Design a protein around this ligand. Sequence first.
Ligand code: FMN
Ligand code: FMN
Ligand code: JTU
Ligand code: JTU
Ligand code: DET
Ligand code: DET
Ligand code: ORO
Ligand code: ORO
Lengths: 365, 365
Amino acid sequence: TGDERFYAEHLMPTLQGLLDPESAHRLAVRFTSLGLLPRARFQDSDMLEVRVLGHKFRNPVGIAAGFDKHGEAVDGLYKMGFGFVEIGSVTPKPQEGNPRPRVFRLPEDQAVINRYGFNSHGLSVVEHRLRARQQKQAKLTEDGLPLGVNLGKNKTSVDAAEDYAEGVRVLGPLADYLVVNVSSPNTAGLRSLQGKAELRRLLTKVLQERDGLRRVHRPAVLVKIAPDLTSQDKEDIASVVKELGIDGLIVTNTTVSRPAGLQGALRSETGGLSGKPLRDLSTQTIREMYALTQGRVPIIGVGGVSSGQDALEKIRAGASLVQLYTALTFWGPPVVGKVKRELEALLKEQGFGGVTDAIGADHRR
Amino acid sequence: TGDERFYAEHLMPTLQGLLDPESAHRLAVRFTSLGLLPRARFQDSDMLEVRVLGHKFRNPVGIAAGFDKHGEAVDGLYKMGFGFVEIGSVTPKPQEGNPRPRVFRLPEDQAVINRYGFNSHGLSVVEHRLRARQQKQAKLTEDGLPLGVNLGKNKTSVDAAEDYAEGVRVLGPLADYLVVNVSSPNTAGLRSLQGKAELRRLLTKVLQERDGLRRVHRPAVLVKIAPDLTSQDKEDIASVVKELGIDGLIVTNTTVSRPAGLQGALRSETGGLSGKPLRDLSTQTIREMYALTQGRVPIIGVGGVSSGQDALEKIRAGASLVQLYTALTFWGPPVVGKVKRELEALLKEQGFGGVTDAIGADHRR
Ligand SMILES: Cc1cc2nc3c(=O)[nH]c(=O)nc-3n(C[C@H](O)[C@H](O)[C@H](O)COP(=O)(O)O)c2cc1C
Ligand SMILES: Cc1cc2nc3c(=O)[nH]c(=O)nc-3n(C[C@H](O)[C@H](O)[C@H](O)COP(=O)(O)O)c2cc1C
Ligand SMILES: CC[C@@H](C)c1ccc(-c2nc3ccc(Br)cc3c(C(=O)O)c2C)cc1
Ligand SMILES: CC[C@@H](C)c1ccc(-c2nc3ccc(Br)cc3c(C(=O)O)c2C)cc1
Ligand SMILES: CCCCCCCCCCC[N+](C)(C)[O-]
Ligand SMILES: CCCCCCCCCCC[N+](C)(C)[O-]
Ligand SMILES: O=C(O)c1cc(=O)[nH]c(=O)[nH]1
Ligand SMILES: O=C(O)c1cc(=O)[nH]c(=O)[nH]1
């Protein structure tokens, strides 16, 4: 907590004052991958353990996709205290993404707007990087620290479904779960894959490919959705998920909306908005998807989590696990232990024996 | 905290299971007014004290209008640990309000929908009730526990401005601050008084009447606004407030919106929605009004506050004081001490010397 205060009040604001956010991002990935951070002090208690998606998670707090896009910092992220790590999005071929600048801080809103556009080292590079530590990961996974891989589509792809199928074939065998990212606001036409008929065709193909993998190399498949869906869109997704036996949902990606009240000078930049202004939009989307799937489909809740209260609100709304990203950029590494310690305190205060007991609790009130 | 858990987990859910919400409301007012609650244990520290609106507030946590509509429970509310009490809305003549049922719980959303329609004992009854304890209130106020009076308009009023003027004349001399409630979603035509030209005419008249009161009986005047305003509406309110020297704003009343994701069976009932689903809508409205008024106009922040984090988010967005109501209905009296204790902890954790230092802090980031 002295550490928490030092990072939040001194170190992070200073780094943000010195570097543009993309440079700071690159440096953070480098520092994390070199293990230069001291190992997090918080010791995960048994009440934080969750069993879902065919795996044990030592704690329910993960790092969201987009921080480690290319799988370079996975071990340093576990060292920070994350219960699970998701890398990506990874596209089949390497691609540069959008021209710079393409990421913007909104400090007054504790938010970020990004339009990276799936900058990716590509499947082949990431495959080799993961293969180099594959057995180390197998041990981590067995110890309750799973790895997720988030798949995207190349900008010039003439067949979206084949892009995702290729990712299943190449990175599926290296992942505990795969995410079909059909919700980036930064690749033209992508979010239209959330529509009923596309989504059914796409996910049938993804699931066929996944089912074709050898048993020990067969990941769970999750779909990551936008916070900007119509009620019709959400009903349709819920129906397809149940029809096909999709293993879970990630709720939500960034928003293309700009909520009333944003103060940052850069609020009108094109891109997806993340952080505090997204928080309750995400929570409400979790609540809706949990109800539509009858609580039978595991949800990873993401968007604006920066405290134990934020985490518990998403868990009570229906999330089995949560992720954060934007909070790390403002508060630094100590935010992980902060969220975990506050979550444990609140679980006890509200009479929950553990995280598992709190999942979807608001729906039973 | 054992008390907190008993109320939240046992007592309150049991009362809610036994009584319709209007009956429970009536019983709560009666019990509070009889002092039947034990006096709250939390001792207000100096870091919670705020000086604003020409008064000292021992702590920044108030009870919002609509709980004690007729000024029957003011002393019992201070006993609960509220730093200030707001009664009302009070209409010039007595009126029954809407037919029953007119209030609805949404337990799955931690929300309420109400359409009371300004049920009021009227000015004359409330005047006598306040006069009976006027000197007791003068001492409370001097000790840092001010009283606000919220004014409404009768359903059949042929002249809204004169309704508010009458309230200023009759209850102004008994109040530390008055609130011109132009934001009830439950009286036809009322919210149109938020428009620039009406509002200017109305508030000029209110301020003239207030200025006509003797110095020691001259209250601050605040305007309470909706969370459903357009950007144009908010710009216009900010402009009128500065043009006329209005003393403060109360942000916000209940919403006529129904955010995506509401789960309660009663979500489609007509009325204003309060509680958790309103929280971030309110916070964003505070953020916007603070910026539009350059931080020079005190804001009382209200909508979905049930924790110290909720309170601090509104303070950092620009609120000098906060109020709650809906949280009390789910968590009971211990929620007041809970909010205060958590707020104090968070202020220390974030390096604020006191509440005053945190006011509008997000705008300086
Ligand atoms: C800079 C940045 C890059 C991102 N890249 C990706 C990505 O490649 N794939 C993806 O599925 N989500 C991506 N996201 C979205 C996050 O995974 C997460 O859904 C979103 O930011 C909400 O969480 P937060 O508010 O905690 O940041 C990115 C977010 C940010 C801020
Ligand atoms: C049952 C009920 C009655 C209310 N009556 C009034 C009222 O008479 N005047 C008023 O200005 N606001 C009234 N409100 C609004 C509250 O003062 C407050 O602005 C709103 O409920 C948001 O706060 P909360 O989420 O903490 O309840 C009422 C709210 C509720 C739930
Ligand atoms: C790994 C070192 C710690 C101290 C660290 C953590 C996060 C950051 C950081 N990461 C970002 C990632 C993505 C984006 Br977009 C922005 C950042 C920023 C930033 O806001 O500049 C920071 C500081 C920098 C350093
Ligand atoms: C004053 C006694 C304490 C224990 C108490 C506090 C609040 C309530 C209460 N107040 C309400 C006020 C307005 C509305 Br609308 C509803 C309530 C409810 C309720 O949800 O039924 C309660 C329980 C009941 C008892
Ligand atoms: C036309 C060239 C396409 C190759 C794309 C390059 C890989 C993506 C760039 C990510 C940034 N990087 C970490 C390499 O510096
Ligand atoms: C036509 C009769 C108008 C008189 C209105 C009565 C006062 C408002 C009712 C509030 C409920 N009460 C607390 C009295 O039971
Ligand atoms: O690469 C990006 O632009 C990106 C992808 C994504 O899924 N979400 C996001 O906010 N940005
Ligand atoms: O009496 C009511 O109906 C009422 C008034 C008000 O200002 N706000 C509200 O939600 N209800």
